[model samples]
Structures are given as C-alpha cells and as structure tokens.
Target chain A: VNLSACEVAVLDLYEQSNIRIPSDIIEDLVNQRLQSEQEVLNYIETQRTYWKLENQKKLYRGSL
Target chain B: VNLSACEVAVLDLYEQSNIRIPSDIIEDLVNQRLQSEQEVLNYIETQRTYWKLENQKKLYRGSL
Candidate 1:
C-alpha cells in the first residue's frame, strides 16, 4: 500500500534477485514505508546476511 | 552496471510491467545514474507518455 517510487523500485530489484526477504520485514516496512535513503540503506543492510545465505542455498541446491 | 538499489528496484518494476520503456531513455539514464529523487521523477515523467502509449498499443492489439 505504501509504495513510494523508490520503494517500488527497490522492491522490484528484490523480486528480480533470487534472494527472498523475510515477509515480516516487508509487512513492517510496508506499514511504515521507509522514508529516506539512510533508512533504505539500513533496511538493505539488514538483508545482506539473508541475501548471502539465500544465494548460498541456491548454489548448494544447483550443485546437487 | 550502474545498479543503485533504488534504480534496480524501479527497473525491475518496469520489467514486470507489460509496458516497455524506450531503450534510448534507458541508455541515457543509465549514463547519468540519476542521483536524486527529483531526477528520478523527471525521468519517470518523461516515460509517462511512452508507458501510456505502449499500454494503448497493447490494448489495440489485444482487442483486434
């Protein structure tokens, strides 16, 4: 619902990637709508570990 | 190559949509790497015409 242009774009990027963000985070951010670049950076930073882990999972799955 | 998170997201949104943006515009924007929200808005505003026209073209093609 709270789709700012930037957020919409960033979400699209996420969709394009193999990494899946935690739904609870999405629900929370969607409710507040991260309002600044720094906020976005913070949110993105939180996801780095998740993104890395997901990529590893995909790699492992692909090899098997 | 110039993959800012916000820009990546927006481009993904474009990809998800049936409407296609002009490649030249993409090339131009990619070169500049829109550094601020106002620039993004400006670029997006330029695309409104293309997006609208492409949607109409799709509608026409589908109806026929």
Candidate 2:
C-alpha cells in the first residue's frame, strides 16, 4: 500500500475517536479544549506510555 | 495552561505529505537517523512552516 501503515494507525485512532465523539467535539477538543482536565489526564497517560517505550528503545539502541 | 495547543501539531505532518510519499518512507524516515538528504528535506520544509507560524505568534505575544 502507498500509505504508511503507522500513520494510518494513528489516523485510525483519530477516526475511532470521532466515532466515539462528535466531530465538532473532537475538533473542539483537539483544537481548543484538549487541555481540559479529562482530556489532559487521558493524554498524559497515553503519551507517557508512548514516550516511555520510545525512550526504552532508544536506550537499548545506545547500549548495543 | 492545559496542553492542547492545536493537537501538538502532529510530530509528523500527516496531511501535507501523504499525497507525495508512501507511509513506509515516512515511518522509516522518522524512526531512523532523519539524516538522509531526501528525508531531511521533507521534514525541514514541513516543520519550518509550522515553527515559523509559531514563532511569529510568540514574537507578537512578546511584543505586547
């Protein structure tokens, strides 16, 4: 496929979220309200996990 | 104070590059050294536009 599977995965997450929440809500949240308490909490948790794994991989790369 | 300032602007520019390049190249570009001439060109152009706008806003804000 021409599309990057990884980007598609991230976009899939966005698409899935849209299905869960209204487009207006998602847009507002992403653009204007993502920092709201609930969204922030969720974002921090998810991003922390992502970064932690990324860091771990980088560390492993450096060690080898 | 909350972190939602335009959805973190996507670490990768999804909408801009999708039409021209395949996703594998994007993933490989991001994950690898990001030093390949072609990949660097892609990133610099995409990111320069993003940061320029951000810097302009910051400058305007600072002038106030």
Candidate 3:
C-alpha cells in the first residue's frame, strides 16, 4: 500500500524469487528506512532465516 | 505491514484491479477495524474519489 518504488521493486523481486516476506519484516524494513532496492535486497538476504521462519509461522496459521 | 487475511485479500483485489491505495487510507482502514475483505472493498468503493486524489498527489510528489 502506497509503497515506495524501491519497496515495490523489492516486492517484485521477492515474487520472482518465490520469496514471501512476513508483515513484521516489512514493517521493520520500513522502520529501517532502507533507501534503495538493493539495500532492501541485501537486508532480506542477510536475514533470510528469520524471514523464512516468520513467513512459515504465518503460513502455518493460515494467515497468508 | 502485519496485515490481516482480509487486508491481504483487499491488497490482492487492488493489485488485480490495478488500483493503488494511498498509505494513509491503508492506515485509516486499519483504524476503521473493518471486519472483512468485503467491508474494505465497500469502503474503497465509497471513497473512490478521495483515494484517487490522494494517490495522485503522492504520485505527483514523486513518492510512489
């Protein structure tokens, strides 16, 4: 919603990569004030496991 | 983020419909505490013009 171009780009990349980010992670990313698509991509890559687990929990709860 | 299932559904519908909601509207919807996807859809339909204007403003500001 009202996503920045970079955030939109990151979402597109995630969709293409078959990655689904958890909502909390998205909020965190916003809070982190990531300035570019590459920065967000780097953050996601660095916290891959945490994102994965959170996404999994959401999935398990049938919330996705 | 941390969207509910209904919010997620609304986002999906907006994506499919090629409609972009302003972040303020999203925040407002959260405050509205809409109970279902249809409820949000109805809200969007009712406030279509305002939403459009806000989105346009954001776009014009080169923010979206």
TM-score of each: 0.31, 0.22, 0.38
Please give the CA lDDT of all the candidate structures: 0.48, 0.34, 0.54
Tell me, by TM-score, which candidate is best.
3
List residue ranges in candidate 2 displaced over 4 A: A1-32, A58-64, B1-64
For residue A35, what is the lDDT in candidate 2? 29
RMSD of each: 20.1, 16.6, 13.4
lDDT for residue B11 in candidate 1, whole number 0-100: 57
On residues B1-64, what C-alpha lDDT tens digit does candidate 3 reach at each position? 6566777777676665555444545666777777976677666455554433322221111212
Each candidate's B-chain TM-score, in sequence, is 0.49, 0.35, 0.65
**DockQ pick, better of 1 and 3:** 3
Q: DockQ (C-alpha) of model 3?
A: 0.04
Give the distance in Å from residue B33's predicted Cα in candidate 2 to where it truly belongs: 22
Clashing pairs in 2: A4-B23
In candidate 2, what are the lDDT values of residues B1-64, reduced to their tens digit? Answer: 2222222233333344332222323343454455344445445345444332322221111111
Q: Among all windows of ten consecutive residues in candidate 1 chain B, which has the lowest summed lDDT?
A: B55-64
